[PDB]
Design a binder for this molecule. Structure first.
Ligand SMILES: OC[C@H]1CNC[C@@H](O[C@@H]2O[C@H](CO)[C@@H](O)[C@H](O)[C@H]2O)[C@@H]1O
Length: 276
């Protein structure tokens, strides 16, 4: 059955996890957290403990603001990577790790579309493989590797699979995507779940790996968010059959992505996610 996850809008302390479970009226199967590449596992541990004590899987989006793909492929981050691998192995529990993500966008300093042009398919693949190699050399077989694409290719040189590091280095593929509604002054428009996700899914469906929707959410403005939610989960279950997990992005950020941005959105979300 479809696993239900969330980034709960703050680092997932015990109380933040429990509070979200009360909010959505259901167990979180996956708890999502973002960290950077100057964060030791000792900082992560208490969060990890809360997640596993709850009976959930921890997915960590591991964001190398501190190293780009050239730095990483050349081994400049290896001391930090090695420590993380050793500490995660020692921890021993199943952790889903999503390094270097949305690399077919242009907003991250490790992304192929990033305006400095420093990141290429080759440097990206070499970087990703290097990370995995180090984890494997340190026995961290408990760490599952999540490859990721943004729903849209944004920026020069971007593609869904040009930076794909190979089935030998990947446990899950994943897609991120947002219905921005009419909230953005550049000219965003309301998009249904299908309109957001269908292109990326077609590309990833050609890969023999299960798929996670690692980040998704909808604005309130420019359409009916409650109906969007109902239809999104229906779409996932009906036509996105390789998708095994749906992980909401619950934060009032660029717009109000929260499941409780309105009472009607919340009601729809509670019903949509199901018993399981
Ligand atoms: O634009 C929509 C989202 C698209 N995906 C990444 C999100 O940013 C991430 O958001 C996280 C939670 O705010 C932060 O901890 C990370 O540093 C940051 O990279 C965006 O808000």
């Amino acid at each position: 059955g479809l696993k239900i996850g969330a980034w709960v809008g703050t680092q997932p302390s015990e109380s933040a996890i429990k509070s979200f479970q009360e909010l959505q009226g259901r167990k979180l199967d996956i708890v999502h957290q973002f960290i950077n590449w100057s964060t030791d596992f000792s900082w992560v541990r208490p969060y990890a403990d809360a997640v596993y004590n709850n009976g959930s899987i921890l997915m960590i989006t591991w964001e190398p603001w501190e190293y780009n793909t050239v730095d990483i492929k050349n081994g400049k981050a290896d001391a930090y990577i090695t420590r993380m691998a050793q500490d995660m192995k020692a921890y021993g529990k199943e952790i889903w790790l999503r390094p270097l993500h949305e690399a077919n966008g242009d907003w991250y300093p490790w992304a192929i579309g990033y305006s400095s042009r420093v990141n290429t398919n080759e440097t990206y693949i070499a970087a990703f493989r290097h990370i995995v190699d180090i984890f494997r050399a340190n026995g961290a077989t408990n760490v599952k590797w999540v490859f990721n694409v943004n729903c849209d290719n944004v920026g020069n040189g971007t593609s869904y699979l040009g930076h794909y590091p190979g089935d030998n280095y990947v446990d899950y593929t994943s897609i991120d995507g947002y219905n921005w509604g009419t909230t953005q002054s550049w000219g965003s428009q309301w998009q249904s779940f299908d309109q957001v996700f269908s292109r990326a899914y077609q590309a990833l469906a050609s890969i023999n790996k299960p798929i996670i929707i690692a980040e998704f959410a909808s604005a309130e403005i420019g359409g009916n968010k409650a109906r969007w939610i109902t239809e999104a989960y229906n779409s996932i279950r009906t036509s996105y059959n390789k998708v095994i997990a749906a992980v909401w992005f619950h934060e009032n950020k660029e717009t109000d992505w929260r499941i409780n941005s309105s009472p009607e959105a919340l009601a729809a979300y509670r019903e949509a996610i199901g018993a399981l």
